[PDB]
Amino acid sequence: AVDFSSCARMDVPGLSKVAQGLCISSCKFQNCGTGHCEKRGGRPTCVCDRCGR
């Protein structure tokens, strides 16, 4: 929906990069789901949505 930011806070230990790398690739395999780290108060969520070109 918004291709500009993606865990650019650098607040997490650092694994968030690999955790999203897999969440994105895995959910991308379907070609209709992009993995995004939706975190706010410390709740890292793995949302997958990328259907429709």
Side-chain angles (χ1 to χ4, degrees), residues 11-32:
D11 59 322
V12 286
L15 66 97
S16 193
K17 223 179 74 264
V18 191
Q20 65 186 111
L22 61 90
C23 241
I24 188 288
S25 261
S26 67
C27 276
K28 180 271 137 207
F29 207 60
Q30 71 198 300
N31 312 60
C32 270

Side-chain angles (χ1 to χ4, degrees):
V2 292
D3 195 67
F4 267 102
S5 268
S6 55
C7 265
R9 239 86 210 162
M10 230 157 301
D11 59 322
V12 286
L15 66 97
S16 193
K17 223 179 74 264
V18 191
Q20 65 186 111
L22 61 90
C23 241
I24 188 288
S25 261
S26 67
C27 276
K28 180 271 137 207
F29 207 60
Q30 71 198 300
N31 312 60
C32 270
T34 183
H36 276 289
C37 55
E38 181 85 61
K39 188 249 251 220
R40 290 175 308 167
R43 213 102 293 192
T45 311
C46 178
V47 296
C48 306
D49 57 313
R50 186 108 220 164
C51 211
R53 202 134 185 71

